[PDB]
Amino acid sequence: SLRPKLSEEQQRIIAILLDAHHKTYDPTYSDFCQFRPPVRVNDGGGSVTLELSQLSMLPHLADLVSYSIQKVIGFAKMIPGFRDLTSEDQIVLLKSSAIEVIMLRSNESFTMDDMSWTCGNQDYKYRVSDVTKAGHSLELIEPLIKFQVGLKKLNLHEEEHVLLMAICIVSPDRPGVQDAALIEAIQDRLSNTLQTYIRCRHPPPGSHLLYAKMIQKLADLRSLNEEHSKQYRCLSFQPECSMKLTPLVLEVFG
């Protein structure tokens, strides 16, 4: 069972992606006080009527997601080969993957301590009850939490985490892509880097079938993407919803 060494180029790709992530993911969440403030209405009963009437957490979470899409755009532009694509394909890939990369990158704030995304004091701790206060339902939230725990338990090296985000973005099977072959060539270069990295740098037993497990998470993300889109559609029917979102969020999901 051969373990070819990482090529000079593969090492450079990993370094570039690590740098890109470090430049676009602030692990202190220090910008979050700039978003519209979180508001949490009394909704212990999980009333859909109340949740939609108030959408109390939506301005804050929409601002968080919008900010994150901006960061993902920056990250993607640093992926080796991404700028070889036409502008048209670049935008198709970004719009189609945005929610998935947000779900992946959020794993860094997710904690199994209490099953929350913890981004600071209580104000910026996001629980399932906060997501329902933004107008989403359990059909999305429950599998989202299951996804976060499963990803956590893979214990990815940061190298593997950034590669997975890059592979997710540069996917040739997204609707509307023009040069699928070029996209696939870029993705293959990243996939080969990841497979090679795992085999020579990830110790047992966590390395066992790890590449296959990571590829399965990409398939899981497709499912969550589809469910999020259905739910965003519903959310959009609420009068005055657009003011609680942002122009970038409206474009990406509308």
Ligand X SMILES: C=C1/C(=C\C=C2/CCC[C@]3(C)[C@@H]([C@H](C)c4ccc(C(C)(C)O)o4)CC[C@@H]23)C[C@@H](O)C[C@@H]1O
68 binds ligand X (CB under 6 A): yes
Known binding residue 68? Answer is yes
User: Hey, how many other C-beta atoms are within 10 angstroms of the C-beta on 22?
Assistant: 12
Known binding residue 22? Answer is no
One of 75, 82, 126, 197 touching ligand X (CB under 6 A): 126
Nearer to ligand X, 14 or 235 (CB): 235
Binding mask 73-112 vs ligand X (x if CB under 6 A, - otherwise)?
Answer: -----------------------------xx-xx-xx---
One of 14, 20, 61, 151 touching ligand X (CB under 6 A): 61
User: Hey, how many other C-beta atoms are within 10 angstroms of the C-beta on 185?
Assistant: 14
User: Hey, how many other C-beta atoms are within 10 angstroms of the C-beta on 19?
Assistant: 12
Nearer to ligand X, 64 or 170 (CB): 64
Strand partners, 125: 118
CB of 174 to ligand X, least distance (A): 18
Alpha carbon of residue 53 to chain centroid: 28
Known binding residue 109? Answer is yes
Stretch that binds ligand X, among 8-16, 37-45, 56-64, 167-175 (CB under 6 A): 56-64
234 binds ligand X (CB under 6 A): no
d(CA 150, CA 161) in angstroms, rounded, equals 13
134-153 residues in contact with ligand X (CB under 6 A) are: 134, 136, 140
Beta strands 125-126 and 110-111, pairing class: unpaired
User: Hey, how many other C-beta atoms are within 10 angstroms of the C-beta on 87?
Assistant: 8
Residue type at 177? V
Known binding residue 222? Answer is no
CB of 69 to ligand X, least distance (A): 9
One of 13, 55, 62, 162 touching ligand X (CB under 6 A): 62
CB of 6 to ligand X, least distance (A): 28
168 binds ligand X (CB under 6 A): no
One of 94, 119, 166, 167 touching ligand X (CB under 6 A): 119
Copy the structure tokens of residue 188.
């293959």
- Which residue shows structure tokens 């989202």? 144
Stretch that binds ligand X, among 3-11, 37-45, 57-65, 158-166 (CB under 6 A): 57-65
The b/e string for 190-219 (b: 16+ C-beta within 10 A; e otherwise) is: bbebbbbbbbeebeeeeeeebbeebeebee
- For 184, the 3-state DSSP assignment is helix
d(CA 98, CA 126) in angstroms, rounded, equals 20
d(CA 142, CA 3) in angstroms, rounded, equals 38
Chain residues that interact with ligand X, rule: CB under 6 A:
61-62, 64-65, 68, 102-103, 105-106, 108-109, 117, 119, 126, 131, 134, 136, 140, 232, 249
Q: Mark the binding-site residues, compressed into ranges.
A: 25, 68, 105, 109, 136, 228
